Amino acid sequence: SQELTLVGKAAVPDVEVALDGDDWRWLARKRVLTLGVYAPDIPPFDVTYGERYEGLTADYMAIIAHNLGMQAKVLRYPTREQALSALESGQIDLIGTVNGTDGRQQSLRLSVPYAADHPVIVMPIGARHVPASNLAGQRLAVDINYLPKETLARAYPQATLHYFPSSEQALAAVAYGQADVFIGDALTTSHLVSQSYFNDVRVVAPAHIATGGESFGVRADNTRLLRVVNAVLEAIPPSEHRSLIYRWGLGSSISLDFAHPAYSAREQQWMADHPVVKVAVLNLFAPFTLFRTDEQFGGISAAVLQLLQLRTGLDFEIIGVDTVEELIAKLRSGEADMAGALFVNSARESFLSFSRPYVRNGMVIVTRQDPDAPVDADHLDGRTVALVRNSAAIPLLQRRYPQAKVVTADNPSEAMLMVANGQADAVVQTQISASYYVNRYFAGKLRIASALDLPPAEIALATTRGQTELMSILNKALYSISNDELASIISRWRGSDGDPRTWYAYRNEIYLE
Amino acid sequence: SQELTLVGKAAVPDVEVALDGDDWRWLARKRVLTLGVYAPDIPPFDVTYGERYEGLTADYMAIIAHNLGMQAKVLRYPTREQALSALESGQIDLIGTVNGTDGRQQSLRLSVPYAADHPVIVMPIGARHVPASNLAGQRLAVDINYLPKETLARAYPQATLHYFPSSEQALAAVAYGQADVFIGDALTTSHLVSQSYFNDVRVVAPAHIATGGESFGVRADNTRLLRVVNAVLEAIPPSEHRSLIYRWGLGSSISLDFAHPAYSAREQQWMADHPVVKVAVLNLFAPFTLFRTDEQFGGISAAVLQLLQLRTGLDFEIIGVDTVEELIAKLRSGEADMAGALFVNSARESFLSFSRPYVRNGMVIVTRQDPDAPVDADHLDGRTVALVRNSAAIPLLQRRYPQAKVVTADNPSEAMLMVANGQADAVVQTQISASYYVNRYFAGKLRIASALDLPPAEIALATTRGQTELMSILNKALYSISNDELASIISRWRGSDGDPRTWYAYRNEIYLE
């Protein structure tokens, strides 16, 4: 048994609480409300530093203590089973961070969940669709602390269970090939994946295992305490439930109230008749559409398409082409049902329909890092400037900067290589794309001279205009995707500027021996 | 005049609204509340795609319409004044997204702002402080549309103003060397920066110019409608204001509150006596502490210290050393006041004191990509595993993996290279750091084998056990840093798995011809 002091957010909200005048005076004499917490310490619920207790459970404990005029105390127990006994004594009035599988005890009763929480199914980036076959033949990794061994076994009997000390270890397994699937807590998964594993795994569906959200547990006879705690929790508005979830960085898990878009008669029967949708993408349009060292589809678009898959349940199959002219070709003929990423273009709006854009970004001209390179975009007079053939930018550019000499290339990658080779003085790119390339691969060879005085580029999904049922389905889904998820996705694709030259250097010395 | 459909978003809130009942049935008879919005379209407040209207303003219109039992309609007008003309006309009941410089118009009445927004000053990432002498002689970039020229000139009279078509072009100007300082509103600035400009610039302080938040405008004549709207707007809790801010990806702007940490007198005078604090960091500890191509301090930690400055007003001076021994050497000797990033360590807690961790990450083993390489950490029997000399990790590892043969190196970069060279069969790393190096610089040479069944590593600030006021201040600051901002920093530092072997390939082919 260890005592801790509760820090849980600076400004704790006031909820409208309605209690029996007899309930209030009971609380008044009780003085101290004691929460008990336990062994592993599983973020974001439980976070321990020094003598201080904090976390999502801490925060609701804070909300309960504050709105009931109570002094909060915290004791921390070496194991979950010792904590359960601490409740019985009852040395402590509340136990923290318990779900549906701990009461499930009958010795203990659960408060209304203070945190919405359900189990989710995680698979590697490549994996397509849920094994709706109830994960048969799969190696299913789980936190030993999350679900009871036989809840899984009953729900996934043809799956091979493999238990790990922690949620992270289970998830690591799926990332690094020791397991095929992960089942885990939605909140903690969201944390783990967003922080640093989003390249390795993805949340693919909810699991058909019922757990309660996260709750406080109160000893079974203590029917009065359950009343007054629930009095508070029920009064917490959803805005506060949400606000706290964003703060612990679990913004990715809001979406996990999963199926959300309401679909038409005409739309969902289309979805039955077209379970697989064919997407055309550019092979070298980084960081928007690309293929990794894995031969795997990747980039901002690949990330968004994956979410669209979560929202619609469609299975996207990706077809990669080298040039833009080819991409449109496959779109017209129906070889491809949709474009993964196209700049919104009024010219092609003749025959194409664009989704709600999911990237809006400004443009820049990239030059070599020679003394002779155009110093900035206002000094483009008589210099050769690379653009992609038939770009919406091309008319606009020679309108704004007429002394600039436009030369065209087939795809965005060749346009940039022209500048790297000496065949051009500048190339027009989105800031995201240019920023990316310059610091990542061309440190000390290329540079962003300046912005262009053009309107911002918009990147979207595209279909042929006839494709009406698809586009309304995509747009419905795209609307369900918040700009926070898009920003999280984009910024983590742009990344940060490190020191690739020191490490090009190390890879090169090693190659000599 | 074109009408738009307010896109039905998420879960629109119920606020506790109090109205007269002469008011309530007046609303019942009225049926429809009509919002007017106008051509320019200002993300994230006003966004148009086709016939659909969305944005921060859209969301609050919804809250007002919903909580007052109204069907909301939106008409979109080609010029601001055409909307103004519709307002007097009574075609529209309220006009959207008007702020403090339009309640300097007095011709219409403004609701209490539904979204707080203030101007901020943006400078290049390297900057320390706003330039002295009210930005005199500096090149100040602003959106032509943000502030009225005479407002800037009154406040920054000695400054060279440079106006731009857009907020992004202004910010682009500071990023790419054409301007020195940027001014714009916290909400749209936070989006631009957090989305893709965080490598190039930073928000440094608020600008001493008052603008109102964003408000609705209603006909001056219509005092009844002003009452009922404000009835709703006032009742929207701070959680809901925040949640919407988070959803639109502007979580970064809550940090521009600005200051929240309350400091003691003993502390406030310590900060006085030591305005400059010297931080020791490892030179090649990516993505935590490193020096990038600029010879500039970079990594997760630098971002975090950047935040620590903003929260405390200390000036951090960065001292880069090559090894851990060397680092601690400077920490004991007093050359350095604190460590930028150290693993939390039970051994050193005798003479070292650790901060609240700001990275918590589980550990992994990296092996070469030979068939000989260990398959996972359970198959390390008789294999050599590189760790850093006197690392807290070593004991824990040989306790768990007793047949494993530890070999040590001076720093983390050297420890990893041991595996690259052939001097070790595997190396111990944080999963983040390993993930980074492997996919970024060592594609097809190194790989992550599996997680380790050890506790997660914790990265923290460190001082000598004596430096108490320093540590106390750092911890106060670190608690004020939301777990959401830390997550945003870590993900953009891990970044994403691309195709480095392609661009190694293009770069060498360019130099060969």
Author numbering:
A (entry chain B), B (entry chain A): 33 to 545
List sentences from the manuscript:
The virulence regulon of the whooping cough agent Bordetella pertussis is controlled by the two-component system BvgAS. The sensor-kinase BvgS harbor extra-cytoplasmic Venus flytrap perception domains similar to those found in neuronal receptors, and it is the prototype of a large bacterial protein family. BvgS is composed of periplasmic Venus flytrap (VFT) domains, a transmembrane segment, a PAS domain, and a kinase and additional domains that make up a phosphorelay.
The periplasmic domain of BvgS (residues Ala29-Leu544, which includes VFT1 and VFT2) was produced in Escherichia coli and crystallized as a recombinant protein with a 60-residue-long GB1 domain at the N terminus and a 6-His tag at the C terminus. The structure was solved to a resolution of 3.1 Å. VFT1 and VFT2 adopt typical Venus flytrap architectures consisting of two α/β subdomains called lobes 1 and 2 (hereafter L1 and L2) separated by a cleft. The two VFT1s are open, while atypically the VFT2s are closed with no ligand in their inter-lobe cavities, consistent with the structure of VFT2 alone. The VFT1 cavities are each oriented toward the hinge of the VFT2 domain of the other protomer, and the cavities of the VFT2s are each oriented toward the H19 helix of the opposite protomer. The VFT1L1s interact with each other through several hydrogen bonds between their H8s, while the VFT2s are not directly interconnected. Both lobes of the VFT1s, VFT1L1 and VFT1L2, contact the hinge and lobes of VFT2 of the opposite protomer, forming the largest dimeric interfaces. In particular, both the Ct loop and the N terminus of H19 strongly interact with VFT2L2 of the opposite protomer through hydrogen bonds and through π-stacking interactions that involve a conserved residue in the BvgS family, Trp535. Thus, the kinase-on state of BvgS depends on tight connections between the periplasmic domains and the transmembrane H19 helices.
